[model samples]
Target chain A: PQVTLWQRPLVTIKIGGQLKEALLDTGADDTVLEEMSLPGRWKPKMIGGIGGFIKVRQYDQILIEICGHKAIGTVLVGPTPVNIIGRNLLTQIGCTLNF
Target chain B: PQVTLWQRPLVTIKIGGQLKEALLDTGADDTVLEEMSLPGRWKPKMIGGIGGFIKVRQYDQILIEICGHKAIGTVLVGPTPVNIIGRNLLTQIGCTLNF
Candidate 1:
């Protein structure tokens, strides 16, 4: 299916229970989140990779609604220097990057 | 308690073992990082909240060095839009925020 990609405002969901504004990107594979800002509840899961399957946990989920487009997905909790929107979400929203 | 604040370049640390560049912000109570960019292995822990002591975890840590000033700390880890430098590190580095 042809994907539609566009820059959209992102929302930050606190692992402890809070929401903030963010930017959305559509070029990532998995749902990623900040590590330092995550809460404690969201259980951690395992993900397969080259080094072998690693244990990953979900702390918060980003919520975005643009032009009637809405999505709620879990983000990998961790420390990050900047916020980003990845392909995992882009594919769901049917987005295609324009560069 | 007295605190000093300053702005400096930030670096992203992947939970799985990746690094990136990001912005830094101070004035926040806790260190806030991006969520969607974490790797596996970083275990989750519990945190205290209104509902009670919630489970929190550590996934990644940010590294910054500026003008003979260097500090490293872990962010909460979760979905966020922008990179931030919080008081946790500010107090450590003796930073004071200016308006």
Candidate 2:
């Protein structure tokens, strides 16, 4: 799928058996998700973005389907404004930027 | 130019007569740069991202060359970790996401 950046680059993803929409963020180094329940032990971590930083729970080896393509990567759960699919998973799905 | 997500999607941009590298971020709503002096009257504004928010000076109608293509868009100046070329400018350069 090739998507123009004229609008928010939102994509549908399936995580934890629930369908969700997340931003495909090339600027983010790690994928961060809103606070949710996942069956595993997570370690406390902090991630910084364009503005500031926030404390997050790092959940590694999570399986998610991005635009229907399956991928396994580290996912951080925190109080994020929106779900972000960062390079960690973008690379697994072979997402790219072009002009 | 096409870029893979295997590494940071950084590109050369010319701003204020300086050659700098910036990330093309699809997740960001507006372009934001590191603190630098730009000739213009700006308004104080705050923007939030994945983690938290930050105060910035909004300079509208800023002219910049992204990957050698000229574009004029709103640019925010603040204490950002890195220069980010968000969707606002990415659209002008016809950047897109492909898989």
Compute DockQ for each candidate against the true complex.
0.02, 0.82
Model 2 chain B: which ten-residue window has the lowest total lDDT? B46-55
Instruction: Say which docking band candidate 1 falls in.
Output: incorrect
lDDT digits (tens) for residues A15-75 of candidate 1: 3344444344322335544454454467776653111344557654555443335556767
RMSD of 2: 1.1
The true-versus-predicted C-alpha distance at residue A92 of model 1, in Å, is 2.7
TM-score of each: 0.30, 0.96
Which candidate's TM-score is highest?
Answer: 2
Model 1 chain B: ten consecutive residues of lowest lDDT:
B1-10
**Candidate 2 structure quality by residue, lDDT tens digits, A28-75:** 889998899999999999887755678999998999999889999899
In candidate 2 chain A, what residue range of length 10 has the lowest lDDT sum?
Answer: A45-54
TM-score for the A-chain in each candidate structure: 0.46, 0.96
